[PDB]
Amino acid sequence: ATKAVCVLKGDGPVQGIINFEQKESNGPVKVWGSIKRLTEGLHGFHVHEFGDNTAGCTSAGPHFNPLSRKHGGPKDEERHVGDLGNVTADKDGVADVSIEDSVISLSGDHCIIGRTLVVHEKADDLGKGGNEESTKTGNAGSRLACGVIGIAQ
Amino acid sequence: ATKAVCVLKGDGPVQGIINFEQKESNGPVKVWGSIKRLTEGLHGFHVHEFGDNTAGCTSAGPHFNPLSRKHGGPKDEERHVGDLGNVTADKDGVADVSIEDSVISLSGDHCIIGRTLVVHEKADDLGKGGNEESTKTGNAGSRLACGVIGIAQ
Ligand SMILES: [Cu+2]
Ligand SMILES: [Cu+2]
Ligand SMILES: [Zn+2]
Ligand SMILES: [Zn+2]
Numbered sequence: 001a002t003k004a005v006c007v008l009k010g011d012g013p014v015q016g017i018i019n020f021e022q023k024e025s026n027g028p029v030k031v032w033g034s035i036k037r038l039t040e041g042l043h044g045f046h047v048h049e050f051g052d053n054t055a056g057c058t059s060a061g062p063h064f065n066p067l068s069r070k071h072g073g074p075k076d077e078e079r080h081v082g083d084l085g086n087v088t089a090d091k092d093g094v095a096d097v098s099i100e101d102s103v104i105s106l107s108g109d110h111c112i113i114g115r116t117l118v119v120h121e122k123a124d125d126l127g128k129g130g131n132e133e134s135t136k137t138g139n140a141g142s143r144l145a146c147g148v149i150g151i152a153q
Numbered sequence: 154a155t156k157a158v159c160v161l162k163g164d165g166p167v168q169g170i171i172n173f174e175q176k177e178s179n180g181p182v183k184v185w186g187s188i189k190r191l192t193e194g195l196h197g198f199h200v201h202e203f204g205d206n207t208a209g210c211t212s213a214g215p216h217f218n219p220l221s222r223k224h225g226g227p228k229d230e231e232r233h234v235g236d237l238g239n240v241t242a243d244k245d246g247v248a249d250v251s252i253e254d255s256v257i258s259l260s261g262d263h264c265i266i267g268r269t270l271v272v273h274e275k276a277d278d279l280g281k282g283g284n285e286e287s288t289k290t291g292n293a294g295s296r297l298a299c300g301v302i303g304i305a306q
């Protein structure tokens with residue numbers, strides 16, 4: 001079993017802690033935790049390629065996309081490995097994260113350790129937006145908070 | 154060449170950016186960077202096991218030691234994988250780091266990606282201090298700043 005943890009922080013008030021657990025196998029990864037001070041509504045949630053936070057969340061690069069596909073939702077056939085969809089913040093700005101994904105991994109190739117998890121400004125349209133940007137970023141907007149995914153015990 | 158980067162920050166003014174570069178899977182890793190706001194003198198510099206900073210540098214765990222070896226310096230046969238010795242801060246409190254290590258790696262089992270790089274308050278005795286702590290931590294003291302090592306371009 002492998003565990004990973006990520007502490008999200010940004011230029012503003014958004015902060016949170018997301019845990020990852022991949023039961024003793026190369027099976028699905030369970031992602032869970034919470035993010036606070038988020039505006040009410042949907043927020044794009046993705047794993048970006050670089051675990052470089054030298055210029056904040058901007059240096060994290062594009063979505064992790066080892067297979068060079070187009071952006072999509074988590075349950076779509078075509079998506080970037082790092083496409084985790086949207087998390088939802090309530091009227092209090094708290095987003096409860098509970099995701100189970102079988103595309104990301106905590107080990108080998110589709111490995112997200114040492115990469116950046118980011119929560120966005122707007123909702124991810126899951127590639128259905130009908131414009132150029134939709135198939136790249138899902139039109140999720142700016143990066144509110146991010147963190148480098150590290151190994152945990 | 155594989156690259157990684159680490160942004161060091163702590164509950165203090167100590168901060169720095171360290172770059173890692175490894176040409177081949179087997180081969181030395183060059184670590185280059187600089188940290189500032191340090192007190193002039195020697196300061197412990199090690200890779201700790203967990204990339205967990207939920208509780209600051211406190212949650213990074215002990216030195217990365219997959220081989221169950223005792224604490225030492227970079228040139229010692231007997232050393233933890235994460236033992237990078239001392240970093241020297243000058244009168245202005247700036248510590249330039251230019252290390253080449255053959256035990257740490259950005260690939261494989263000794264992989265430091267996703268773990269925490271930490272700069273200590275005191276000098277690291279390189280495990281020659283003659284007491285339990287020396288063979289454990291090198292008596293380097295507090296963790297002033299730290300960061301999770303992530304993938305870079
Ligand atoms: Cu994103
Ligand atoms: Cu240490
Ligand atoms: Zn995407
Ligand atoms: Zn050590």
